[PDB]
UniProtKB/TrEMBL annotation, chains A, B:
NCBIfam families for this protein: bla_class_B_core, bla_subclass_B1
Cofactor dependency: Zn(2+)
Protein name: beta-lactamase
UniProt-listed InterPro entries: BlaB//VIM/IMP-1, Metallo-B-lactamas, NDM-1-like, RibonucZ/Hydroxyglut_hydro
Annotated organism of origin: Erythrobacter litoralis (strain HTCC2594)
CDD domains: NDM_FIM-like_MBL-B1 (cd16300)
GO molecular function: metal ion binding
Binding site for Zn(2+) 3: 163, 205
Subunit and interaction comment: Monomer.
Keyword terms of this UniProt record: Antibiotic resistance, Calcium, Hydrolase, Metal-binding, Periplasm, Signal, Zinc
Binding site for Zn(2+) 2: 88, 178, 205
Lineage of origin: Bacteria, Pseudomonadati, Pseudomonadota, Alphaproteobacteria, Sphingomonadales
SUPFAM superfamilies according to UniProt: Metallo-hydrolase/oxidoreductase
Amino acid sequence: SVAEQEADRDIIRFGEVSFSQLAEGVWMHTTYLDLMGFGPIPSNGLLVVNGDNTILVDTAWTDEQTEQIVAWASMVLAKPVRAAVVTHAGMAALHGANIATWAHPLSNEVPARNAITFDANGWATGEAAQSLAPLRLYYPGGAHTRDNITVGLPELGIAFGGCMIKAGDASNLGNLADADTAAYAQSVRNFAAAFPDARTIAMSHSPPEGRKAIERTLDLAEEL
Amino acid sequence: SVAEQEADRDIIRFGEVSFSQLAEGVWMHTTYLDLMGFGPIPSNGLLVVNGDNTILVDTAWTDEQTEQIVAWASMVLAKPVRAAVVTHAGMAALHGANIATWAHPLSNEVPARNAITFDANGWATGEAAQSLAPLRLYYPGGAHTRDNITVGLPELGIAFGGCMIKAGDASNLGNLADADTAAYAQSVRNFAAAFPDARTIAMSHSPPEGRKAIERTLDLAEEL
Ligand SMILES: [Ca+2]
Ligand SMILES: [Ca+2]
Ligand SMILES: [Ca+2]
Ligand SMILES: [Ca+2]
Ligand SMILES: [Ca+2]
Ligand SMILES: [Ca+2]
Ligand SMILES: [Cl-]
Ligand SMILES: [Cl-]
Ligand SMILES: [Cl-]
Ligand SMILES: [Cl-]
Ligand SMILES: [Cl-]
Ligand SMILES: [Cl-]
Ligand SMILES: [Cl-]
Ligand SMILES: [Cl-]
């Protein structure tokens, strides 16, 4: 249940969206999907303050939920979303709101409008790096998908692993139908080394925890 | 725990193997693996009496466990295993025991010694059909793997779905890293139509139940 899943934490509710604060100016948005009736599954992303605007990491499950995140930033925070980045292939809602959207260039080969320039070490450069700061964008290699990316806030000790990172007590890596199974373990090692000091690890389908999420994900990936 | 998993049923223990009777002359063998310490996971197969011998469906997790199944048939039942069929790509133990082993011809492209001849409707013919009777061998198409097969005992109302069929309360299809995701739903429909009357559905990683296992697996496969 949603109530059981949120009993741990201090959650602010806005429509169907659950907001929780990871750090000053760093919001996690959580929404739920129960499509076949099997139980609500969370999807998490971030809303990060920069000056008088916010930067969005990932959409919610639905257009209507994504519209609520945009409205919370504009109406409540009074810091409208000006840019968004998705970590894997809701988008229509962002474009309806004239939000500049960013993705890995090969993801979804509705696309994001802007393709991130990644250097050969996996770090974003150019307009993506300027526009999404203070987020640091990192491409670790193929894992859950070929083109999955990650983001970090090194000054606040937060790293977001998207769909690549699973919970510290996970027993499997979920759906590997699109996965690069041979590369997965090294990509997790690359992520861990890109954000080596962060003690708050956030991810797409489990609540935030510590670096045990990286350790367990790596162990599972090494068995593929 | 193994005890919690077997609390429902009447289990006979032989070494590491749990045996349960699905029908007169039809044994299910269950063994457990807890490789990374996350909890014991069952693997199920069948041991089917034919006259003064038995036919084995699938190995256990390990060579040592598979040796125990062979010993139970020879020592306890006094009906030694004379043939075996595997439903997806322990084998060394069967060959050490001089057991004739059968598999889909394209599986594992240690191989089974004998390749099943399947007709264009998916039914085994030839030596496989003679040697593994009363089991009826059926290739439904790609699903959990490209070459997964299934077996049935239509006169006893039992069908065994291997790794393709999941539990009636499952919320996912497990590991799809090798799956034919586009074909999965039709292959499940093919299996259901091949064994249309069986009310006991057995499978590789969950205990036997009714046709809800087919219904749920099909629903999950239709979402791929
Ligand atoms: Ca709306
Ligand atoms: Ca600029
Ligand atoms: Ca390991
Ligand atoms: Ca032994
Ligand atoms: Ca013969
Ligand atoms: Ca359906
Ligand atoms: Cl992607
Ligand atoms: Cl470069
Ligand atoms: Cl896994
Ligand atoms: Cl860091
Ligand atoms: Cl196979
Ligand atoms: Cl034919
Ligand atoms: Cl699934
Ligand atoms: Cl039948």
